[PDB]
Amino acid sequence: MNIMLTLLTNVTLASLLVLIAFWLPQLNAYSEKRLPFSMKFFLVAITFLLFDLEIALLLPLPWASQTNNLKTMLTMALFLLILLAASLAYEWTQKGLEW
């Protein structure tokens, strides 16, 4: 309820102020007178997507520290971060981070 009302107020104020900005100077009269598709940017976007997926895997860490199985969770988190570093290293050594 409160969050819905806050978002609605933000959107309403932004819309009102942008529209008055776009319409206040529209009342007075004036004159009123490709291909390249670089591959590197796509690789940057795909690398961002994959790293974002691995980050999403890393996100439940603050709650995983209270499990009473500390050794197993530490091993698994270190494993995830090690494979993240391995992905970065593989893309580094295969000339995937060049311009």
Partner 1 sequence: AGRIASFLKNAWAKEPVLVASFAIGGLAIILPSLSPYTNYAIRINRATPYNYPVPLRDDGNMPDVPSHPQDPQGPSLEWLKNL
Partner 2 sequence: MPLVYMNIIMAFAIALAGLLMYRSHLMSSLLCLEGMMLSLFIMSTLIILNTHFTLANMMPIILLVFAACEAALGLSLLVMVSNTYGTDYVQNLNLLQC
Partner 3 sequence: GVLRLVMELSGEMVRKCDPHIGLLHRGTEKLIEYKTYLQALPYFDRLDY
Ligand X SMILES: CCCCCCCCCCCCCCCCC[C@@H](O)O[C@H](CO[C@H](O)CCCCCCCCCCCCCCC)COP(=O)(O)OCC[N+](C)(C)C
35 in contact with partner 3 (CB under 8 A): no
Q: Whose Cβ is closer to partner 3: residue 38's or residue 94's? A: 38
**Of positions 5, 26, 28, 99, contacts ligand PEE by CB under 6 A:** 28
Interacting residues of 77 by C-beta distance below 8 A, sequence separation 6+: 58, 61, 64
* Least distance from ligand X to the Cβ atom of residue 40, Å: 29
Q: Are 58 and 91 in contact (CB under 8 A)?
A: no
Tokens coding 77: 């988190």
Return the one option of partner 1, ligand X, partner 2, none that residue 72 interacts with (CB less than 5 to 8 A, by type).
ligand X
